[PDB]
């Protein structure tokens, strides 16, 4: 392990904290189909 | 076939910087055997404020391109003559472009001479009348006086411009200096026709 | 070395040689009313007639009525002699983008 | 505070600030990856399903052309504004109208 | 010559620049990759 190390990657510092952020008040599922809805609309 | 579309394209490219030419032409076929046998061509033309300015034709087998001390000894004695010089053209081979002596003898030349534009370009800069190629915009320099105006509208320093190489075809043929101005119209597919104004900087070579 | 840039006076383009636009922009709207829903989640007090129920709309209603409490600053330029060039727009005189 | 530990004596007071339910008219951000342009974040407005047994997001057919999305397993993501700001930038910019 | 003690042994596990497939500078989930699936 060194200090230089953290930064490089897609995995490092950079690119996976600074670029980018684990973040709170989220949420994921799998998209489905219905017609019902309008296009400015989610269910 | 460069010599041949060199030998029409010089005197096109005098006239479009506006200059008179001050030898007679010759014809084409002493102008092969003065390149050949004499090693280069001279071609002098004046300027509208008096400058004069002299092109050098260099063949590709003469020996001012392959040895330093012959074109440095040339280039001495030619800025040594009194005549009101403002700009010399050393036309060579593209391949003299990599030659690291040849340019170490032009930057020297350069250095000692520091009131007088030197400046070495390939032949294909000179193969065609430049300006008429469908591929180019408008090129046109600007004076510093409205180039001022326009920086002082648009709140503007002449180093945030977009820049052009002095060396630049277009800009050769406009006779561009560092530190000008050039204001290009150019074809637009969005609004049917666009103007910029382009910084121009130093020469490449 | 000197770290501390110096200080800056803030320079007003007179109103009758503004160069920028007299309509606001869809980003500057959406700035205002979120700016001052935020200040009306902050106090509640408005001069708008009309009762609303969240800040948001009382923020929409405000700046569509011309009573936003507001100013829009366009930084123009930043003079390396200490001048900050900007221009002051005041969105209740100002053209309101397509916010629907 | 949380609301089951609340006390009798309790009441919201100017100043408050109350986190509560999503309910349906509230918007949001839908996202799926890759982002690859800029209608692969939109705002939509939320449709609550009372159903239970429902875990999917659901959306029209039509909609999928903003994420190249289809429903053969593809997720996505979606987070509701919380702050007074982001709401009013998300339904005045970030709409997918 | 004969001793096996100090062999190489990298000689017995052996038979004697960017990865193009690989998703390095693609941003997405580990656990969404199911929306690269060509269908
Ligand atoms: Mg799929």
């Given at each position: 392990p060194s200090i230089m190390r953290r930064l490089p990657r897609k995995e490092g510092r950079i690119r996976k904290s600074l670029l980018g952020s684990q973040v709170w008040s989220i949420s994921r599922s799998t998209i489905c189909g219905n017609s019902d809805l309008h296009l400015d609309e989610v269910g | 076939m460069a010599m041949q579309k060199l030998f029409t394209y010089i005197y096109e490219f005098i006239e479009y910087r506006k200059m008179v030419l001050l030898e007679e032409k010759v014809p084409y076929d002493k102008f092969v055997q003065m390149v050949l046998n004499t090693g280069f061509f001279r071609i002098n033309a004046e300027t509208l404020n008096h400058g004069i300015v002299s092109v050098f034709i260099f063949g590709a087998n003469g020996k001012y391109v392959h040895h330093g001390g012959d074109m440095?000894?040339?280039?001495?004695?030619?800025?040594?003559?009194?005549?009101?010089?403002?700009?010399?053209?050393?036309?060579?081979?593209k391949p003299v472009l990599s030659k690291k002596n040849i340019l170490?003898?032009?930057?020297?030349?350069?250095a000692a001479n520091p009131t007088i534009v030197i400046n070495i370009y390939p032949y294909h800069l000179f193969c065609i009348n430049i300006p008429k190629v469908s591929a180019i915009p408008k090129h046109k320099l600007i004076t510093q006086e409205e180039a001022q105006e326009?920086?002082?509208?648009?709140?503007?320093?002449?180093?945030?411009?977009?820049?052009?190489?002095?060396?630049?075809?277009?800009?050769?043929?406009?006779?561009?200096?560092?530190?000008?101005?050039?204001?290009?119209?150019?074809?637009?597919?969005?609004?049917?026709?666009?103007?910029?104004?382009?910084?121009?900087?130093?020469?490449?070579? | 070395g000197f770290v501390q840039a110096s200080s800056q006076t803030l320079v007003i383009i007179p109103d009758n040689e503004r160069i920028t636009s007299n309509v606001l922009t869809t980003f500057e709207a959406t700035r205002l009313v979120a700016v001052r829903a935020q200040?009306?989640?902050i106090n509640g007090s408005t001069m708008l007639k009309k009762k609303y129920s969240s800040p948001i709309d009382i923020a929409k209603q405000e700046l569509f009525n011309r009573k936003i409490p507001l100013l829009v600053m366009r930084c123009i330029k930043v003079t390396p002699e200490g001048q900050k060039i900007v221009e002051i727009w005041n969105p209740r005189e100002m053209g309101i983008p397509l916010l629907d | 505070?949380?609301?089951?530990?609340?006390?009798?004596?309790?009441?919201?007071?100017?100043?408050?600030?109350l986190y509560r339910d999503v309910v349906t008219g509230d918007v949001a951000f839908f996202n799926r990856q890759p982002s690859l342009e800029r209608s692969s974040i939109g705002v939509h407005?939320?449709?609550?399903?009372?159903?239970?047994?429902?875990?999917?997001?659901?959306?029209?057919?039509?909609?999928?052309?903003?994420?190249?999305?289809?429903?053969?397993?593809?997720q996505?993501?979606?987070?509701?504004?919380?702050?007074?700001?982001?709401?009013?930038e998300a339904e005045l910019l970030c709409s997918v109208r | 010559g004969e001793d096996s003690s100090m062999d190489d042994i990298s000689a017995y596990s052996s038979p004697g620049l960017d990865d193009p497939f690989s998703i390095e500078d693609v941003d997405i989930s580990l656990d969404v990759l199911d929306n690269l699936a060509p269908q």
């Amino acid at each position: 392990p060194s200090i230089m190390r953290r930064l490089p990657r897609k995995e490092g510092r950079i690119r996976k904290s600074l670029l980018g952020s684990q973040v709170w008040s989220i949420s994921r599922s799998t998209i489905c189909g219905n017609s019902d809805l309008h296009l400015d609309e989610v269910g | 076939m460069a010599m041949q579309k060199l030998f029409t394209y010089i005197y096109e490219f005098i006239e479009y910087r506006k200059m008179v030419l001050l030898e007679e032409k010759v014809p084409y076929d002493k102008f092969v055997q003065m390149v050949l046998n004499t090693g280069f061509f001279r071609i002098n033309a004046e300027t509208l404020n008096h400058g004069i300015v002299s092109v050098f034709i260099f063949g590709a087998n003469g020996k001012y391109v392959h040895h330093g001390g012959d074109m440095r000894t040339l280039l001495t004695n030619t800025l040594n003559e009194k005549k009101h010089y403002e700009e010399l053209i050393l036309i060579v081979d593209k391949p003299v472009l990599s030659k690291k002596n040849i340019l170490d003898i032009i930057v020297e030349q350069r250095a000692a001479n520091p009131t007088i534009v030197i400046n070495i370009y390939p032949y294909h800069l000179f193969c065609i009348n430049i300006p008429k190629v469908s591929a180019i915009p408008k090129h046109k320099l600007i004076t510093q006086e409205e180039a001022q105006e326009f920086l002082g509208r648009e709140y503007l320093q002449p180093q945030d411009l977009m820049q052009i190489s002095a060396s630049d075809p277009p800009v050769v043929w406009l006779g561009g200096r560092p530190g000008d101005f050039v204001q290009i119209e150019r074809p637009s597919e969005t609004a049917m026709h666009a103007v910029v104004i382009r910084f121009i900087t130093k020469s490449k070579i | 070395g000197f770290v501390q840039a110096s200080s800056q006076t803030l320079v007003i383009i007179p109103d009758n040689e503004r160069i920028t636009s007299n309509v606001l922009t869809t980003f500057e709207a959406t700035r205002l009313v979120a700016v001052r829903a935020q200040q009306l989640a902050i106090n509640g007090s408005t001069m708008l007639k009309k009762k609303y129920s969240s800040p948001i709309d009382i923020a929409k209603q405000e700046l569509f009525n011309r009573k936003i409490p507001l100013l829009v600053m366009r930084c123009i330029k930043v003079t390396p002699e200490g001048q900050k060039i900007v221009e002051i727009w005041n969105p209740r005189e100002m053209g309101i983008p397509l916010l629907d | 505070h949380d609301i089951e530990g609340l006390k009798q004596d309790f009441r919201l007071e100017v100043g408050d600030i109350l986190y509560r339910d999503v309910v349906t008219g509230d918007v949001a951000f839908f996202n799926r990856q890759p982002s690859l342009e800029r209608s692969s974040i939109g705002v939509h407005r939320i449709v609550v399903l009372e159903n239970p047994k429902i875990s999917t997001f659901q959306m029209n057919v039509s909609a999928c052309a903003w994420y190249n999305a289809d429903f053969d397993g593809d997720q996505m993501n979606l987070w509701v504004p919380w702050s007074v700001m982001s709401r009013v930038e998300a339904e005045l910019l970030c709409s997918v109208r | 010559g004969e001793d096996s003690s100090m062999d190489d042994i990298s000689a017995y596990s052996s038979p004697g620049l960017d990865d193009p497939f690989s998703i390095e500078d693609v941003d997405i989930s580990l656990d969404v990759l199911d929306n690269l699936a060509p269908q």
